[PDB]
Design a protein around this ligand. Structure first.
Ligand SMILES: [Cu+2]
Ligand SMILES: [Cu+2]
Ligand code: NA
Ligand code: NA
Ligand code: NA
Ligand code: NA
Lengths: 620, 620
């Protein structure tokens, strides 16, 4: 009954039939993206219309199309042909990944490069990577992937240990042509293996770890209704899943007495970029937009009980479309559980004689994705005290290169002859705010130091200042950890019992933002990543910080274009976009498989409640 | 047998007898501090000598003494009379806290102030607070406490809800004189109660939380031998306890193959200061040195199974001295357990077909202390992958004041008429480093941005730079979150298999440091807190960043004095001192009892190992 329910297999099958009958899904067509559209603002008329947005690619070279379909009515709402040299190419298809290695295997230039290195072409894996936009005029309007080669010594070998440096190829995956093969010189292929399940590398496995058993003898404290509606410890929300963004949280609200109070209308990771900092021409083009170019949701893992998710786990199994419009279930793709989280509040009072301890817990919603060598976990946490937190977990195998004789300023050495280029992993969280409703505003809060003098004779005072962001042109903000900078999202029309506007404070980790030169291609295509915080006025079509069509888009799309409208954001329907990321200088300990590292952000209540919201937690 | 074993009740009883027989523990004497001295550098001669350091106060006004005793030999090693106007007063005694309220109850000025406010003196609690050093010349060389008043409506009432603003008194606790009573005007006493166990404030307790059961059916994976020696998942360490510092970690080492590799010789929180930022003369003197003035170990809580520590818990019960030299056990004062910690490493490889997941865990060592209204948890964590982390948890009841009509730049409003002054909680971690032995050095690592141009034609490259700190005068460092600044502690004489020096990287949270004017009394007494990182050359007597005698010391003791020696720290026995803290602008949600907030730091291996140290973790 809920408009925010997950897409069903039946809905996707109906979309396929509607597209086929309309003549839009012939044998040459591929679905590059399919997802449900959110209800438009003002759905308080019960007139639900389940609409789907579809990107249709054509493998014969005809123009792709963007199509909107109503499964409720069984109709095509609109269908637009796309000029991809103007607005960008469609996301990469899973089936194009295979084309790259097969095409290169028959190319004379590729074979002569492998022959010079005495490599058997049957053992050479090619990583198919997105192209970006650089100096190659012949690439405008064509679908290009670039390939980097790795040697697999046997079928279960980790090819990442054996990069073939000095060699790169570019491939037109529609015309099936190899456009360029660049060979800058022979580097030795690193010889040590990286097989982290091989007993001679691991040694004998430890026998010292005793089991930890986490159970819930009465079941979990949360309920799931309507497939994806969660109620847990006064929280209420809907768990969505989109093939591009992955897990999306809708309608995050908190039950305060008999009032259901909204906090966040929609929360998602709306882009993530992985730029490489190696100036070698073999890799200086390398930038992954995992969300916008590859679609992180379609590579979500099936999560295993006891290994990936431990405890009393409730699973969701979202359904997505394959490239032909058939529904595909991602079995056990989302884990949901609660976790003990230590002490919530504690005080032993000498005067009253009362000793008081309460324990905290959090609700966890998570999925894991694998894009080539990298694996990312996305974790959303809700806490008893009203805190909302996101955490990204990065693991997998680092991308490798040769390590040059005589060292490098831009590459770490991991093993003899084996290097790992410097890079970043940068995320954009899109937070469509609804603090007690939709009239919100953002204030920037800095600590204020005071000078010793009149009215501060002992030089101990310090204060804070808040600056309201009133227009989009002034709402592009930088972190300042030294001044304790945070941002408060408040509702100026909703007051707590002290007559102060209710609010939530965003605490950033204050990690470095995009390091590339501001004149670079990546700085233009990932402009969101150059600043810590952006605030826009909500609009239906402003969904991604990088635009709708990220693949091979020349630049400037998304946030820099949106904020040029300079709209009023002072007590309006607003969206916060927070950039955060990891700067990765690989260490020896990251090899041959990397222990998890993390980054994230959190939001804490700031006068949202009239007192602590966890006074009614029992003693346990 | 180990020299690092905890003090026994028998040792403390022997110290008492040795002091008594030597004529140093008559009826007028009080022990203000007692603790075991660590072995001096070079204990590889098996000639153990258990020595104790004792601060002896005299309640008749005679000079206090510092005494060192050998329990091994049964002798007084040295005894020095202290000139407290020069070197500082002894720590505050628990028994002096009671003196303040009792003395004020008979003072004519105090009674007339309470009469003007129609307060019954029997209901007025006085918080006895350390004095600092300000403008009062008569306080030099005297033991002073300052008192602030709160009303307790009935014996189980939370007095913190009822501050009596506009009134402060100073008391000489040795001569038993009230030196000054300052009344700056009548403020209404806030009337709402703050009783967080009262059903009419909490409402009905939730019935929605289902149990989480954490058990270890085969017992824990760590072993405890010799009372306090821990072995866990290749880690080896000794857990100490000192009445001033609390939990101290000794001899932190990691078993790498058949080599036991040292990492940290001694880790402790060696000071913690809580400065208040309210310029009102009622509170502008208020600064707690919880470690140096009050001694956090002596107020450690007895931790309850299932409430404070959940799971399969192993307890330590440290023994301390009371003020008369009798041993006192802090039952269940230290909790030790392991915790599941999510995914350690994960990769699903398309080419090899291998799916790999491993889970992480951490070892937890924790204690909790209560100093008046505040309660602090101290948590040390050891992880499978070699990471060491500290986390402080702050909870309890915020210190309150009146909220002035017309608002304040330095006080938050929590309830009608009830304010909470701004303040910080700042910690100093003292890390006596021993990375693969004692020849260590510190490098500061910044990210380096590169300009687009020759050798970086696409403007994507970025790098890093490391600066060796060679002398103490250049080893006082500030955070810079924007440049990703971290510090690496390395051993230049111990190389990994790539011929790089082994090392560990310190990751700070980059929170603001001390905000007070640099010319203030607190900036002089807590100079450590004005900078994020200090490195000194190890010396036996340089124990605390604030000096040995913090109470009423005029300033400049500790780190600023140590580093003036300008000693060589490049490949030497060095000590890292890291300042970190919380800046607290109280929110409504902090009242009437504050949910936990946290701050800390961590150290991660940086080429310490030759590859990932967790390849031998089994599948579980
Ligand atoms: Cu990385
Ligand atoms: Cu505080
Ligand atoms: Na264009
Ligand atoms: Na909004
Ligand atoms: Na002095
Ligand atoms: Na050292």
């Amino acid at each position: 009954a809920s408009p925010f329910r997950l897409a069903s297999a039946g809905e996707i099958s109906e979309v396929q039939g509607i597209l086929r009958t309309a003549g839009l899904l012939g044998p040459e067509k591929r679905i590059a993206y399919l997802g449900v559209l959110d209800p438009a603002r003002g759905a308080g008329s019960e007139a639900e219309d389940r609409r789907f947005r579809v990107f249709i690619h054509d493998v014969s070279g005809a123009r792709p199309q963007e199509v909107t379909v109503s499964v409720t009515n069984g109709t095509v709402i609109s269908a637009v042909e796309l000029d991809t040299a103007a607005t960008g190419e469609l996301p990469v298809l899973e089936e194009e990944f295979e084309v790259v290695e097969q095409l290169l295997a028959t190319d004379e230039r590729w074979l002569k490069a492998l022959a010079a290195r005495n490599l058997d072409v049957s053992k050479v894996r090619v990583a198919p990577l997105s192209a970006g936009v650089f100096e190659y005029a012949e690439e405008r309007g064509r679908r290009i992937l670039r390939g980097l080669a790795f040697v697999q010594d046997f079928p279960e070998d980790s090819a990442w240990a054996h990069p073939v440096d000095g060699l790169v190829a570019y491939v037109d995956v529609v015309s099936k042509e190899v456009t360029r093969v660049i060979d800058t010189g022979v580097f030795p292929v690193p010889a040590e293996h990286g097989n982290y399940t091989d007993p001679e590398l691991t040694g004998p496995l430890r026998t010292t770890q005793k089991p930890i058993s986490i159970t819930q003898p009465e079941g979990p404290s949360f309920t799931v209704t309507g497939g994806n509606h969660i109620e847990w410890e006064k929280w209420s929300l809907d768990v969505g899943f989109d093939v591009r963004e992955g897990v999306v949280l809708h309608n995050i609200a908190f039950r305060d007495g008999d009032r259901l109070r909204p906090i966040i209308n929609r929360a998602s990771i709306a882009e993530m970029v992985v730029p490489y900092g190696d100036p070698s021409p073999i890799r200086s083009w390398q930038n992954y937009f995992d969300t916008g170019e590859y679609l992180v949701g379609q590579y979500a893992n099936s999560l295993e009980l006891g290994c990936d998710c431990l405890g009393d786990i409730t699973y969701l199994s979202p359904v997505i479309s394959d490239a032909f419009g058939n529904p595909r279930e991602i079995r056990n793709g989302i884990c949901m559980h609660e976790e003990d989280w230590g002490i919530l509040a504690k005080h032993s009072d000498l005067w009253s004689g009362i000793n008081y301890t309460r324990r905290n817990r959090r609700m966890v919603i998570s999925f894991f994705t694998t894009i080539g060598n990298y694996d990312y976990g996305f974790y959303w946490y809700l806490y008893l005290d009203g805190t909302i937190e996101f955490e990204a977990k990065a693991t997998g195998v680092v991308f490798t290169s040769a390590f040059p004789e005589g060292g490098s300023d831009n590459i770490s050495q991991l093993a003899p002859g084996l290097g790992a280029p410097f890079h970043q992993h940068i995320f954009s969280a899109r937070l469509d705010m609804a603090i007690d409703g939709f009239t919100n505003r953002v204030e920037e809060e800095d600590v204020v130091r005071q000078t010793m003098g009149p009215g501060n004779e002992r030089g101990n005072a310090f204060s804070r200042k808040r600056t309201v962001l009133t227009r989009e042109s002034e709402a592009v903000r930088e972190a300042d950890a030294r001044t304790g900078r945070t941002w408060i999202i408040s509702n100026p029309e909703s007051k707590n019992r002290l007559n102060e506007p209710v609010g939530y404070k965003l605490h950033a980790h204050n990690q470095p933002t995009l390091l590339a030169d501001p004149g670079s291609s990546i700085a233009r295509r990932a402009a969101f990543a150059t600043k810590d915080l952006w605030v826009t006025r909500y609009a239906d079509d402003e969904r991604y910080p990088t635009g709708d069509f990220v693949n091979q888009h020349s630049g400037g799309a998304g946030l820099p274009s949106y904020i040029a409208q300079d709209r009023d954001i002072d007590g309006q329907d607003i969206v916060v976009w927070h950039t955060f990321g990891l700067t990765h200088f690989p260490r020896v300990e990251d090899w041959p498989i990397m222990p998890v590292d993390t980054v994230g952000f959190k939001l804490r209540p700031e006068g949202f409640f009239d007192r602590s919201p966890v006074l009614d937690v029992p003693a346990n």
